[PDB]
Write an enzyme that holds these catalytic residues in place. Structure first.
Site, short mmCIF file in Angstrom:
data_model
loop_
_atom_site.label_atom_id
_atom_site.label_comp_id
_atom_site.label_asym_id
_atom_site.label_seq_id
_atom_site.Cartn_x
_atom_site.Cartn_y
_atom_site.Cartn_z
N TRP A 102 -9.20 6.58 -0.97
CA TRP A 102 -9.47 7.29 -2.24
C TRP A 102 -8.47 6.82 -3.32
O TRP A 102 -7.54 6.10 -3.03
CB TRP A 102 -9.43 8.81 -2.07
CG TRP A 102 -8.15 9.33 -1.44
CD1 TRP A 102 -6.93 9.56 -2.08
CD2 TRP A 102 -7.96 9.69 -0.08
NE1 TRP A 102 -6.01 10.03 -1.16
CE2 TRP A 102 -6.61 10.12 0.07
CE3 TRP A 102 -8.80 9.69 1.05
CZ2 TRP A 102 -6.10 10.56 1.30
CZ3 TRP A 102 -8.29 10.13 2.27
CH2 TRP A 102 -6.95 10.56 2.38
N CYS A 121 0.80 -1.22 0.00
CA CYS A 121 0.00 0.00 0.00
C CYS A 121 0.83 1.26 0.00
O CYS A 121 1.59 1.55 0.96
CB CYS A 121 -0.98 0.03 1.18
SG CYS A 121 -1.93 1.58 1.27
N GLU A 137 -4.62 4.01 -11.02
CA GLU A 137 -5.42 2.81 -10.83
C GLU A 137 -6.55 2.74 -11.86
O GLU A 137 -6.79 1.67 -12.45
CB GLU A 137 -6.00 2.72 -9.42
CG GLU A 137 -4.96 2.81 -8.28
CD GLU A 137 -5.66 2.76 -6.90
OE1 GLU A 137 -6.16 1.67 -6.58
OE2 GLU A 137 -5.72 3.76 -6.15
N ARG A 140 0.08 4.77 2.76
CA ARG A 140 0.14 4.52 4.20
C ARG A 140 0.49 5.75 5.05
O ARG A 140 0.35 5.72 6.25
CB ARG A 140 1.05 3.33 4.50
CG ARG A 140 0.39 1.99 4.31
CD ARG A 140 1.38 0.85 4.55
NE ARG A 140 2.38 0.69 3.48
CZ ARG A 140 3.49 -0.01 3.60
NH1 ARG A 140 3.80 -0.54 4.76
NH2 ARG A 140 4.34 -0.13 2.58
C1 HEM Z 1 -6.20 6.84 1.68
C2 HEM Z 1 -5.93 6.59 0.40
C3 HEM Z 1 -5.25 5.31 -0.09
C4 HEM Z 1 -4.54 5.25 -1.23
C5 HEM Z 1 -4.24 6.45 -2.22
C6 HEM Z 1 -4.07 3.89 -1.37
C7 HEM Z 1 -3.33 3.39 -2.42
C8 HEM Z 1 -3.22 2.04 -2.70
C9 HEM Z 1 -2.92 1.44 -4.00
C10 HEM Z 1 -2.65 2.24 -5.29
C11 HEM Z 1 -2.85 0.13 -3.83
C12 HEM Z 1 -2.56 -0.93 -4.91
C13 HEM Z 1 -3.95 -1.12 -5.52
C14 HEM Z 1 -3.93 -1.97 -6.75
O1 HEM Z 1 -3.02 -1.91 -7.59
O2 HEM Z 1 -4.88 -2.74 -6.90
C15 HEM Z 1 -3.15 -0.21 -2.46
C16 HEM Z 1 -3.15 -1.49 -1.92
C17 HEM Z 1 -3.57 -1.83 -0.64
N1 HEM Z 1 -4.05 -0.93 0.33
FE1 HEM Z 1 -4.00 1.17 0.15
N2 HEM Z 1 -4.54 3.12 -0.31
C18 HEM Z 1 -5.27 3.96 0.52
C19 HEM Z 1 -5.96 3.56 1.66
C20 HEM Z 1 -5.99 2.32 2.23
C21 HEM Z 1 -6.74 1.92 3.39
C22 HEM Z 1 -7.70 2.83 4.21
C23 HEM Z 1 -6.43 0.65 3.66
C24 HEM Z 1 -6.92 -0.24 4.83
C25 HEM Z 1 -7.43 0.31 5.97
C26 HEM Z 1 -5.50 0.20 2.65
C27 HEM Z 1 -4.92 -1.05 2.60
C28 HEM Z 1 -4.38 -1.62 1.48
C29 HEM Z 1 -4.08 -3.05 1.33
C30 HEM Z 1 -4.30 -4.20 2.36
C31 HEM Z 1 -3.54 -3.18 -0.09
C32 HEM Z 1 -3.06 -4.50 -0.80
C33 HEM Z 1 -4.25 -4.90 -1.71
C34 HEM Z 1 -4.06 -6.13 -2.53
O3 HEM Z 1 -3.11 -6.91 -2.26
O4 HEM Z 1 -4.91 -6.32 -3.47
N3 HEM Z 1 -5.25 1.23 1.79
N4 HEM Z 1 -3.35 1.00 -1.79
C1 LIG Z 2 -9.71 0.36 -0.58
C2 LIG Z 2 -8.63 1.27 -0.01
O1 LIG Z 2 -8.08 2.14 -1.04
N1 LIG Z 2 -7.12 1.64 -1.97
C3 LIG Z 2 -7.02 2.08 -3.23
N2 LIG Z 2 -6.80 3.29 -3.52
N3 LIG Z 2 -7.15 1.18 -4.22
C4 LIG Z 2 -7.62 -0.17 -3.90
C5 LIG Z 2 -7.94 -1.02 -5.12
C6 LIG Z 2 -8.66 -0.19 -6.17
C7 LIG Z 2 -8.43 -0.86 -7.53
N4 LIG Z 2 -7.03 -0.71 -7.92
C8 LIG Z 2 -9.29 -0.21 -8.58
O2 LIG Z 2 -8.77 0.30 -9.59
O3 LIG Z 2 -10.52 -0.18 -8.46
#
Ligand code: HEM
Ligand SMILES: CCONC(=N)NCCC[C@H](N)C(=O)O
Ligand code: HEM
Ligand SMILES: C[C@H](O)[C@H](O)[C@H]1CNc2nc(N)[nH]c(=O)c2N1
Ligand SMILES: C[C@H](O)[C@H](O)[C@H]1CNc2nc(N)[nH]c(=O)c2N1
Ligand SMILES: CCONC(=N)NCCC[C@H](N)C(=O)O
Ligand SMILES: [Zn+2]
Lengths: 407, 411
Positions: free
Chosen positions: B280, B108, B285, B111
């Site tokens: 968000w 992520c 993405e 973070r």
């Molecule tokens: C606040 C804005 C956030 C942004 C901009 C962000 C950004 C991202 C992105 C770009 C990814 C990779 C997504 C993908 O390629 O499918 C990701 C993965 C992940 N995020 Fe964040 N995230 C945010 C919030 C959160 C929150 C609130 C949580 C949990 C409370 C979280 C937990 C995770 C986890 C567990 C993954 C791994 C997902 C997987 O293996 O499919 N994220 N995040």
């Molecule tokens: C769900 C917490 O936020 N993470 C985030 N920005 N992306 C999570 C996965 C979204 C996915 N890559 C999509 O393009 O819909």
């Protein structure tokens, strides 16, 4: 024990068994992955020689033949006596081709079996090395129609008589720090450029000055040599629609020729083994031109393009990056110098992987290096799972000689 | 043992000691690296150590380690486990736990935000209708009329593995995909199988290119039930381009709230199989992956056509050219509608600051380079140049198999 890798875009699944033949260590453990780190005796020699000679004879369909066993005895006898051994020409060629085949960070390996090997093991002096290198440069450049080659200098003995090429590539540009505090030329080569100066080189002190070769033979102190200018093919960079681009004053050389690595075959170590192929466009356009710590030209280009550099979200860096890379490919192509784009190269590597899986049971690959530094996910390698492991023969990094040589 | 990571652009070197507190396995060995592999009922026996390790971290974090309150809580949990085979988290420990699972999520990039997470405790929920109501409230809270706020909702933990709460959707909001008889796909190809399940369960599909899927919710091991999210709760953005007036006519839109609903949250050995969370979007993405993957909406050609790029040879870089324009369009659109979104430059720069802070105050920050580096313009983001160490800390978010593969249908 038998591992699968999946392509998530095509669902194709490959089974890897080649990794079980792996020997060297990765730097990872079950507790920690180090996949993104850049740098993670007679008694010792026969086991290595044996392992090599078995694979060699197996490759020529002579596994466990008398000629196989005889050679094993011969090399055994030679080690036990001389504490080293010499490769037959056939073995040296095979070892070099396989070092390339096994290079997990190389996207161009579909080409691996077409490598011209120049055996320079008879070389004794730095002038001899310079001659060998000029001939390599001219052969590989081939007036723009580039051909892959490697030149192999004598193998390490007691480590007090190493052959080394001190340059990181046969052809690179110098870097100078100025009073201004800025860097003139290529910042990646500031230190080496200084070592040349401290050695007598007369720097032109320009932005694109081809470094001299610093050649070390038989562990002696290295000597300087200028590569004949007419042997160094360069490409002026222009854009097929921006006429102002040419005014940026950019150029690059056509021949990428890595010279600081160590080739290990059958436990023998070749510390001077310059090798060359041809460029993938992103290497120059994305990395050499746009890395903040390289020629770092994004700001100037962006300005010439009149983009909104006010906010990162206008993606002006990304726009400029694309144009810079269009220009590199266009200029090499116009001048008829071999170059490959990242789309074409990665598609090749996917086909290579599939050949290798069915023919050899696998292909070691380092995803972090194979995926191009721009447009990652629109290239097929991004969606390909890869397994990374170390096979021998191999190319290995080795310490810079100046940190190690005793004058 | 100390491990160093260097940034090759700045020469900043960091020292990791946190990896020492890592327990789970990576998939790698001394002989093989699996860093690019996508996916590489506990006993009382293994439960109390998992609880103790967790409560010890919790009590340290509040500066009460070894206190009477700490010791009594260990004893109380221990007794609860022997007596009931499990235990319940205090609300405070649940919040701490869920923030930490996010903190520890090595894939992520978002973070820097980990400590701002609204935790919705749904452990009193008993039915699929109850789950629906909790999920609407989460979606409305998180959406906040475009000024998005991170949130998670946590349903009851696993007991015997036969009464699991599950959200069958992979995200709370996602578009249907329909396989056509001629082999083409209408809508999002990523959700064809789930869409098919929804239809079989009785969903009347509108069959267009951007149909928001119904929620399919399983409470207490029962068969899942279908619910439509109120349309007024589903914020969407029509995609247009700041200079290209024909871009709007491509007919593109996307939803504002990314909300992953198929992961399993582990805290102190307890398993929360339904814990949807949202934040968000980072622009790439949508604009790189969701729009331009060959296996997703796949719009590169049509955009390239409209722009009249030379498409006869890849080396014109027409795909790369169209990709940048599409991503400009996504950021432009979200910004114009005042819906939170972050670009990949801004996001990765923030991540580097987060990561350095974490080394200084925490002793480490596990990060998965393969996932952290954005899927366009990799090396002009500072993360590309950053060495990373990937290892597994708890609390954590984990993958779990799709529920249609494991569910015992009651009928
Ligand atoms: C606040 C804005 C956030 C942004 C901009 C962000 C950004 C991202 C992105 C770009 C990814 C990779 C997504 C993908 O390629 O499918 C990701 C993965 C992940 N995020 Fe964040 N995230 C945010 C919030 C959160 C929150 C609130 C949580 C949990 C409370 C979280 C937990 C995770 C986890 C567990 C993954 C791994 C997902 C997987 O293996 O499919 N994220 N995040
Ligand atoms: C769900 C917490 O936020 N993470 C985030 N920005 N992306 C999570 C996965 C979204 C996915 N890559 C999509 O393009 O819909
Ligand atoms: C003919 C066309 C070739 C292409 C298109 C190609 C492509 C590449 C690229 C793009 C890289 C990453 C380099 C970087 O980012 O700095 C690389 C690395 C590498 N290549 Fe190839 N290459 C070619 C020929 C060769 C040959 C002839 C050899 C050896 C005989 C070779 C051996 C290697 C090795 C050992 C690496 C990793 C080196 C390192 O860690 O810096 N390549 N190659
Ligand atoms: C830290 C990270 O390992 C480093 O920046 C790598 C990433 N991938 C790379 N890939 C290639 N082809 N060449 C490189 O120099 C790098 N650098
Ligand atoms: C095979 C490979 O690991 C796979 O394509 C990964 C690479 N990096 C990724 N990175 C992110 N952020 N999201 C992804 O889905 C993927 N997919
Ligand atoms: C040396 C064999 O050729 N391989 C290759 N295309 N590039 C190797 C390294 C060159 C380096 N990245 C550069 O941009 O000068
Ligand atoms: Zn690894």
């Amino acid at each position: 024990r038998f591992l699968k890798v999946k392509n998530w875009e095509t669902d194709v699944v490959l089974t890897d068994t080649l990794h079980l033949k792996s020997t060297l260590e990765t730097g990872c453990t079950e507790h920690i992955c180090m996949g993104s780190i850049m740098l993670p005796t007679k008694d010792q020699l026969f086991p290595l020689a044996k392992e090599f000679l078995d694979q060699y004879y197996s490759s020529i369909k002579r596994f466990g033949s008398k000629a196989h066993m005889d050679r094993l005895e011969e090399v055994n006898k030679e080690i036990e006596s001389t504490s080293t051994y010499q490769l037959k020409d056939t073995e040296l060629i095979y070892g070099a081709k396989h070092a390339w085949r096994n290079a997990s960070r190389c996207v161009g390996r579909i080409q691996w079996s077409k490598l011209q090997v120049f055996d320079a093991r008879d070389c004794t002096t730095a002038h001899g090395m310079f001659n060998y290198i000029c001939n390599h440069v001219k052969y590989a450049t081939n007036k723009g129609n580039l051909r892959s080659a490697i030149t192999i200098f004598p193998q390490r003995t007691d480590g007090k008589h190493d052959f080394r090429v001190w340059n990181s590539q046969l052809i690179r540009y110098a870097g100078y720090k100025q009073p201004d505090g800025s860097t003139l030329g290529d910042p990646a080569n500031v230190q080496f450029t200084e070592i040349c100066i401290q050695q007598g080189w007369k720097a032109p002190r320009g932005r694109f000055d081809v470094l001299p070769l610093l050649l070390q033979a038989n562990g002696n102190d290295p000597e300087l040599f200028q590569i004949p200018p007419e042997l160094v093919l360069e490409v002026p960079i222009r854009h097929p629609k921006f006429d102002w681009f040419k005014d940026l004053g950019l150029k690059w050389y056509g021949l990428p020729a890595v010279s600081n690595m160590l080739l290990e075959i059958g436990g023998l170590e070749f510390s001077a083994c310059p090798f060359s192929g041809w460029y993938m466009g992103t290497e120059i356009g994305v990395r050499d031109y746009c890395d903040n710590s390289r020629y770092n030209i994004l700001e100037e280009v962006a300005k010439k393009m009149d983009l909104d550099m006010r906010k990162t979200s206008s993606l002006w860096k990304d726009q400029a990056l694309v144009e810079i890379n269009i220009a590199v490919l266009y200029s090499f192509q116009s001048d008829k110098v071999t170059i490959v784009d990242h789309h074409s190269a990665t598609e090749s590597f996917i086909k290579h992987m599939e050949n290798e899986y069915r023919c050899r049971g696998g292909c070691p690959a380092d995803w972090v290096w194979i995926v191009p530094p721009m447009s990652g996910s629109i290239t097929p390698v991004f969606h390909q799972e890869m397994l990374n492991y170390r096979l021998t023969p191999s190319f290995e990094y080795q310490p810079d000689p100046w940190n190690t040589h005793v004058w």
